[PDB]
Amino acid sequence: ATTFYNVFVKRNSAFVATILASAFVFDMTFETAIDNFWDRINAGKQWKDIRHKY
Amino acid sequence: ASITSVVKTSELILKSPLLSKIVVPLAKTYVKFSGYRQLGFKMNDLIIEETPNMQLALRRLPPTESYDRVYRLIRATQFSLSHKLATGNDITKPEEDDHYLIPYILDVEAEAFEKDALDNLEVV
Amino acid sequence: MALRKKNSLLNMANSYVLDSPQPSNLNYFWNFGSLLALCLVIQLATGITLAMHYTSHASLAFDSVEHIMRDVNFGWFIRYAHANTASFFFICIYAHMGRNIYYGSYKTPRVLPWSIGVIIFLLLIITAFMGYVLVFGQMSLWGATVICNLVSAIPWLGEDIVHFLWGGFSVGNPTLQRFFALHYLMPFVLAVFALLHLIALHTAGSSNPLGITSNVDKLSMHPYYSFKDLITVFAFLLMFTLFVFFSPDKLGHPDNYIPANPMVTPASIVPEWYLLPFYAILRAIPDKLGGVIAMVAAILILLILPIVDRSIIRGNAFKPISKLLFGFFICNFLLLGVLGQVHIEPPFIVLGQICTIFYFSYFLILLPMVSTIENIFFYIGSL
Amino acid sequence: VSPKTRTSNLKNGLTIASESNPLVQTATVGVWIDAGSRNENAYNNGTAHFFEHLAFKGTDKRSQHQLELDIENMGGHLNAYTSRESTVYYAKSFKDDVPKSVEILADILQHSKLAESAIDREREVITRELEEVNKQYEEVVFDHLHATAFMNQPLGRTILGPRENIQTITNTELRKFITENYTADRMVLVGAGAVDHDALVELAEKYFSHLPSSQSPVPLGTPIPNFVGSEVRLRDDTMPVAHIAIAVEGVSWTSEDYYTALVAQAIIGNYDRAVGTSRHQGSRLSNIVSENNLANSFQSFSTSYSDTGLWGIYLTSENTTQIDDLVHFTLKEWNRLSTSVSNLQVERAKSQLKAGLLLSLDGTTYVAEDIGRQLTTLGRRVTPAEVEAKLEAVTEHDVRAWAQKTLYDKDIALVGLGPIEGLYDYNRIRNDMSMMRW
Amino acid sequence: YVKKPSYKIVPHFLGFNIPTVSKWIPIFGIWGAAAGIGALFLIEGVPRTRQDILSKIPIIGEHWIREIPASDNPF
Amino acid sequence: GKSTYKIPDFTPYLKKDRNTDANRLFSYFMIGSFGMLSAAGAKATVQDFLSNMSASADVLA
Ligand code: HEM
Ligand code: HEM
Ligand SMILES: CCCCCCCCCCCCO[C@@H]1O[C@H](CO)[C@@H](O[C@H]2O[C@H](CO)[C@@H](O)[C@H](O)[C@H]2O)[C@H](O)[C@H]1O
Numbered sequence A: 001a002t003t004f005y006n007v008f009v010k011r012n013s014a015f016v017a018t019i020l021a022s023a024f025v026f027d028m029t030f031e032t033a034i035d036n037f038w039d040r041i042n043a044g045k046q047w048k049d050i051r052h053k054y
Numbered sequence B: 001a002s003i004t005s006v007v008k009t010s011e012l013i014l015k016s017p018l019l020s021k022i023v024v025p026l027a028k029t030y031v032k033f034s035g036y037r038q039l040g041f042k043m044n045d046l047i048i049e050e051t052p053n054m055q056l057a058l059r060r061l062p063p064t065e066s067y068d069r070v071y072r073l074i075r076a077t078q079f080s081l082s083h084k085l086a087t088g089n090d091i092t093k094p095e096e097d098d099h100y101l102i103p104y105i106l107d108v109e110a111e112a113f114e115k116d117a118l119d120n121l122e123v124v
Numbered sequence C: 001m002a003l004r005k006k007n008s009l010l011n012m013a014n015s016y017v018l019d020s021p022q023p024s025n026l027n028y029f030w031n032f033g034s035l036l037a038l039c040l041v042i043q044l045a046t047g048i049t050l051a052m053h054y055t056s057h058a059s060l061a062f063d064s065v066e067h068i069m070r071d072v073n074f075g076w077f078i079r080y081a082h083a084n085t086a087s088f089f090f091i092c093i094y095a096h097m098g099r100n101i102y103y104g105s106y107k108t109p110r111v112l113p114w115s116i117g118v119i120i121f122l123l124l125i126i127t128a129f130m131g132y133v134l135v136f137g138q139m140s141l142w143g144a145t146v147i148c149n150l151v152s153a154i155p156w157l158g159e160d161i162v163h164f165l166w167g168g169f170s171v172g173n174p175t176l177q178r179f180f181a182l183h184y185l186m187p188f189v190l191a192v193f194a195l196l197h198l199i200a201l202h203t204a205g206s207s208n209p210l211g212i213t214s215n216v217d218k219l220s221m222h223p224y225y226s227f228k229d230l231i232t233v234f235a236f237l238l239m240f241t242l243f244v245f246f247s248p249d250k251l252g253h254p255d256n257y258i259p260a261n262p263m264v265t266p267a268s269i270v271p272e273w274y275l276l277p278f279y280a281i282l283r284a285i286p287d288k289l290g291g292v293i294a295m296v297a298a299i300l301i302l303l304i305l306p307i308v309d310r311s312i313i314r315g316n317a318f319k320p321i322s323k324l325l326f327g328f329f330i331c332n333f334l335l336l337g338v339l340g341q342v343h344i345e346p347p348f349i350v351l352g353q354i355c356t357i358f359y360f361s362y363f364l365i366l367l368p369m370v371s372t373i374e375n376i377f378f379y380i381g382s383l
Numbered sequence D: 001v002s003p004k005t006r007t008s009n010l011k012n013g014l015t016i017a018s019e020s021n022p023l024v025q026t027a028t029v030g031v032w033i034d035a036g037s038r039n040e041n042a043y044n045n046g047t048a049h050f051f052e053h054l055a056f057k058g059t060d061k062r063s064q065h066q067l068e069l070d071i072e073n074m075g076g077h078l079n080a081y082t083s084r085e086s087t088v089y090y091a092k093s094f095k096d097d098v099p100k101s102v103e104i105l106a107d108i109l110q111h112s113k114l115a116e117s118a119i120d121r122e123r124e125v126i127t128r129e130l131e132e133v134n135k136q137y138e139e140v141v142f143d144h145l146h147a148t149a150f151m152n153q154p155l156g157r158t159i160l161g162p163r164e165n166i167q168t169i170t171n172t173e174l175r176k177f178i179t180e181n182y183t184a185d186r187m188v189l190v191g192a193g194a195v196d197h198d199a200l201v202e203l204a205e206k207y208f209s210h211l212p213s214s215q216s217p218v219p220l221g222t223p224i225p226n227f228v229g230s231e232v233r234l235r236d237d238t239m240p241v242a243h244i245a246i247a248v249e250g251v252s253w254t255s256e257d258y259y260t261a262l263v264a265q266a267i268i269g270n271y272d273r274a275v276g277t278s279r280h281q282g283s284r285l286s287n288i289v290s291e292n293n294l295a296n297s298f299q300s301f302s303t304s305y306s307d308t309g310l311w312g313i314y315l316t317s318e319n320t321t322q323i324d325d326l327v328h329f330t331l332k333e334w335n336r337l338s339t340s341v342s343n344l345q346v347e348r349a350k351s352q353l354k355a356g357l358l359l360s361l362d363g364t365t366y367v368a369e370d371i372g373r374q375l376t377t378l379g380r381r382v383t384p385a386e387v388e389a390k391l392e393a394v395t396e397h398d399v400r401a402w403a404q405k406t407l408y409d410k411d412i413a414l415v416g417l418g419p420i421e422g423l424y425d426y427n428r429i430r431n432d433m434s435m436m437r438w
Numbered sequence E: 001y002v003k004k005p006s007y008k009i010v011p012h013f014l015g016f017n018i019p020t021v022s023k024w025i026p027i028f029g030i031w032g033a034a035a036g037i038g039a040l041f042l043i044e045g046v047p048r049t050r051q052d053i054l055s056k057i058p059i060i061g062e063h064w065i066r067e068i069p070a071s072d073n074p075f
Numbered sequence F: 001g002k003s004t005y006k007i008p009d010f011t012p013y014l015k016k017d018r019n020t021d022a023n024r025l026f027s028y029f030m031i032g033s034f035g036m037l038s039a040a041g042a043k044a045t046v047q048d049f050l051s052n053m054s055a056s057a058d059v060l061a
């Protein structure tokens, strides 16, 4: 906790760099997660699900 | 540029015989064409004053010098707005163009520059 | 206590237009600030009125301007007033900036109003450039094409940025509709920055032609400068009248009365006259990116005047050598303007390069040298 | 090079410590005790200070009047003070009046009457002291500072104690306090000036030999404080001067960072507009404050206790519309101990401290106070050579590392007294404990 | 005996000296990283950013290699 | 009620571990998460919004 504080939080430059890097990761992973979840709840309905017939 | 700088460089020139022989006559002509004496100013009246250092130097003027400076500034402003020049006793003669302010500003700046140096001292 | 002082809203107006303490010796070059405010008011009134009759779609834009000229009551006047006042706006802004440079208005303690002023000047250029495209004549289209393609020089992303600005792969309807929306907005941004530079100025007050403090001798803004401003307002309105009513197209390009045609290229594609010096500077550098940088630097270099002027005295009234150098700098700026509209031919190519070097060397070499030497001459000459 | 401090013990465990100076003609002997208000609980808080009053109210032999006369006849004076962790009773006299003074001190400590009549009389005197400290603003500020920083803990209590206790302190609880706490292993007999060590040891064997020893003798200066970030505001618009203290949890006497905290304290330093030299001091905060007239004075402190401390600054100002600037600039100077200090400031502060720690000891009372303090907090007198070596060991890296764990982004205890409308709320003060640009 | 205090003036400019600036060099580094990460994050959607930078990163880079099936693309 | 040295009762609110790095780190985790979602939300907002200026579907056609 001391170590974590000292490296990522104590300097605001490091804190902001960690926040921005986390935002980048969140953005990419959340995108992928929602895409999969949306595809499962709407399964068989979307064009991607019927496209194979054509 | 600081008044300190200007004064030191001037003193280098005034020392060199060659340099003074060529610079002093030019400087006198420059001052004649400048024409600030025709509005009844002394050279030092023209120095920019909106600086902490200059405000401190002006506060250290003797009251008489200070009251006379205020009058020259008001008088020159009235010539400026009227588009007239000084005549007669209002024209600053070369012998009246004294550096009344230079000693005060040099002392203010001396301390200011010493303070900057001493703020950067390193114990050896 | 008088209401104009007691009420906070009235007191703000009071502080700027009535009790504002001014130097008693401002000369007529201090009148360009109120002329610029007048141009801004005319451009807002005429511009909003033109927007009530103009159609931003590329299929109708040029014809909507002809409808304004032909069918709208007094539309010819509103259109000519708006187009001519754009030129007057630049004459007044060059005069105001020239005043500021000659009298040392950029020096402490007025660095902030000067620096915001440089941004005002950039916003005026953008505003005027977008407004000129809206006619959608030949110069409108081809000027937009060549000026927007300068952005292609930005490394890596330049081409992408251009397509993004255009909203397509060439200047077309998307570009015209966005330029309309931005041309309408930019004058409001410009008014805010104009207000900001005055609020920044209010901490020191106006400088004056002698370069000394005026704290010793102040005059109220009203009635003295109100009535002195009326003289230059009526002089300006006389010049306005001569162009708008008797020669409305003297400052324009005939090619802008031909509808935009992406196929035919006009003989010579030049900016409006007030952009010409910056175009000559761009031509001087052979590299595309080089030229763009030089052209932007030519405006941003105004930001270093507070540093490169090493004088212990504010302004040029008492500095014969600085006055000569300033005279050469101004005439060089006019020559750059002329060279901006000549053909790229001998011997104007080399001349444009020499004038460009002179332009930059004023800021980087001559003004620092001359201002240093004059400091020494004032000191030695008055001993 | 100062003479060596001699140290001896008795059988009970009483330490005798002396430093002779053959150039003076007076001597300060006294008893430093490792005991103070912090040894009381909440019910008998005030006892230690109560005893200090009664110690001079008469013994089994000499009555109050005889005591007065005996000291008058000696020629010098007696003095005492009780703090949170230390009690002192000393006697300044002539060279050859030292055996008299040791005898009187031994008497008032061991054989004091604590007569119900005298308890009852002082009970009013002490009650009046509660309403007159109110004037000593620095003391008001520091007592509130301890009360809040160590909220509901023994170090947070005042020395006088609450009004309620003053009315209920009995001779029984007074006797119990001094029997439990004034033991030989907690006491040091100190002599400075014109004293012979061997003479003083003999006098100790004569007068302090029948002192009780404690059951479990711990070493001298043996002690858990949990600092509370918090604020007390005592706004008083009618006062012209604002008094503000800001502190973080500091270092104990035996911390490894004790010298690092002193050097950091010297980098900020003190300032007083009334002293002529203060406008020329090298400290950055000094320059800011003097140029802008932000304060009449400020005084950096680093107070130590056995197991904790408080490190901070005390400010006084009449500039009531710029208190915000004063606090802002002070805490931004603290930030720079974490972000910016280099060998420039550190070596300058070390130079100033190497002398300062020696300069402070300029009379027999100061010397006695130094021997007594060091013996009751560290168990030994630290030689100037050891002190010079510990200061020399402080680097700029040490100061930065210390400030980053002690000051940077930490809670403060804050006390404001007087016209403090301009002192912002806790969050805005505590937000200046870090810099967003770093 | 000491006749004079022992010191030098370190070079300085605009109130900065090398000892002080050197302490902040790492901080400029991290702020530069913060500004780099932030800038790149802002233009992550730009196709050229993906093509030239993001898709080239090992392992992770395949997140940005996405093809529209030719059957689903009007253009 | 009268003495100002007797601090009012704050025991209902005081945390025992108030001076620890763990204690501060938790609050900065909340602040940081908030800043992280605000950064990701701003980025999404700006990207989707500004894309209106890129060539529209009819232009790309
Ligand atoms: C600083 C303020 C302004 C400047 C410098 C400016 C400049 C210009 C210029 C150079 C043109 C081309 C004129 C032509 O040759 O036909 C133009 C056109 C136009 N401007 Fe402005 N303008 C300004 C403010 C405004 C404002 C506030 C509006 C409000 C909508 C506006 C609306 C228009 C319209 C609709 C046109 C196209 C019709 C036309 O060409 O006349 N302008 N503007
Ligand atoms: C919309 C454009 C502008 C307007 C309406 C405007 C208006 C004004 C006004 C009314 C004043 C006070 C009166 C005067 O000295 O003339 C003034 C002063 C000033 N302006 Fe502007 N201005 C504009 C653009 C600029 C630009 C482009 C610059 C600089 C590049 C600038 C720099 C200044 C400075 C430095 C002053 C103080 C001059 C002094 O009194 O010594 N302004 N302006
Ligand atoms: C020029 C366009 C006309 C509209 C005026 C511009 C509107 C916005 C201006 C408000 C910005 C605030 O501007 C600020 O106002 C206050 C009072 O109004 C001024 O204050 C000044 O006047 C008042 C009395 O007149 C004094 O109390 C004060 O000592 C003096 O500094 C500031 O010098 C000015 O900087």
Ligand SMILES: CCCCCCCCCCCCO[C@@H]1O[C@H](CO)[C@@H](O[C@H]2O[C@H](CO)[C@@H](O)[C@H](O)[C@H]2O)[C@H](O)[C@H]1O
Residues within 6 Å of the ligand: E042, E043, E044, E045, E046, E047, F046, F047, F048, F049, F050, F051
């Ligand atoms: C200072 C800020 C920096 C400059 C800002 C950048 C401006 C424009 C950048 C990218 C805008 C377009 O970038 C593009 O955006 C859209 C979302 O908006 C994304 O598109 C994604 O989501 C949208 C809906 O959200 C779907 O229609 C699409 O099928 C999917 O691929 C693309 O994956 C991305 O390539």
